[PDB]
Every structure is written in C-alpha cells, then in structure tokens.
Design a protein around this ligand. Sequence first.
Ligand code: A1AMS
Length: 168
Amino acid sequence: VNSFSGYLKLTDNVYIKNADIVEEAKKVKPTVVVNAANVYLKHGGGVAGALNKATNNAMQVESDDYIATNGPLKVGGSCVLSGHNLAKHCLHVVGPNVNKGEDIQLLKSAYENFNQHEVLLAPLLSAGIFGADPIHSLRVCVDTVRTNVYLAVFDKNLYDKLVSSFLE
Ligand SMILES: CC(C)[C@H](Nc1ncnc2[nH]c(-c3ccc4cncn4c3)cc12)c1ccc2c(c1)S(=O)(=O)CCC2
C-alpha cells in the first residue's frame, strides 16, 4: 500500500530513514522493493541475504530458476522478479562493486532502473562491502532518480553522516 512513515524528505522525490529494508518492506508492503543484487543473483549476505531469509529462501529458488534459463545480469542492469511476501515485485539491481574493481561510473546506470517504477523502497546502491563512497551514491541517486524513492539505511552513524552531508 506504499504507506511509508518516519522518513526525512531530502528532495521532492528522495526520502531517507535509519531502518532495516526488511522491516520496512514488512510494514509497508510496497509495490517494489529493490535488492542490491550481484550478476548471478546469489543472495548470500548483506541486504540480499536479509531479503532472501525473510522470504524463507523463496527468492533464492526463484533467482536460481531465472539464472538457469537466462544467464547472469550485467553490472548496471536489473531484473523484475516476484516480491514474495515482502512486496508485489522485487527489482534486482546490480550496482558496481568497487572493492572488486568494478567501474563507479555504472552506478548512474544502476539507479536509472528505478525510473521505470513510480515508487520504490530501496537500499543505498554499492555501499557497505561493495565499497562505493556512500555520500557519492546518495548524490547519484538524487541526480538520477525522478520517481519516488524511499531509502532505508540500516546504520545510525552512516544515516547521520548522509543527512549532515546532504544538508551542507
Ligand atoms: C551501508 C549499509 C548500512 C547497508 N545495509 C543495509 N541497509 C538497509 N537495510 C539493511 N538490512 C540489513 C540486514 C543485514 C543482516 C540481517 C540479519 N537479519 C536482519 N538483517 C538485516 C542490512 C542493511 C548496505 C547498503 C547497500 C549495500 C550493502 C549494505 S551490502 O554490504 O549488502 C552490499 C550491497 C550494497
């Protein structure tokens, strides 16, 4: 029902909250939840692991069937699959993993996938163990996405740093 609450409004279409994306998906039941995926859709850890565990592995089984028939995605690409019990759809988006030497310029392409959906619940792409500068990821989101994006960032110090940096 896209009933988001407790978000700071950064711009006319970008919102942010200190929260676990899985708990937000359970509360809101959004039309679209974004997964911070990798090209073979192996949802073992981080955000992807948390979303998969909350579907009791249904997301991993569906992703394996997709990969068997279609092969891996490309960095900057995306795939709409079922949202299972968390949302109507899950938009699996592959941002660059700069810790594994992938090109940071593809982060704009990764965020461009969001523009196909009027409203989305999403994590901060390529942050955490993917190694992108999270302040830069927030700026790319703000400059690229025109649809309504509700960012859930599950770390108080990072959330505070992002808000302070944006408001400078
Ligand atoms: C910067 C981080 C604070 C942020 N983390 C998160 N942001 C939003 N919701 C989250 N839930 C959990 C979580 C993790 C275990 C777990 C176990 N039971 C419940 N859980 C929930 C983590 C998480 C973040 C954002 C983007 C990326 C990553 C991490 S990554 O390291 O997975 C690589 C892909 C890109």
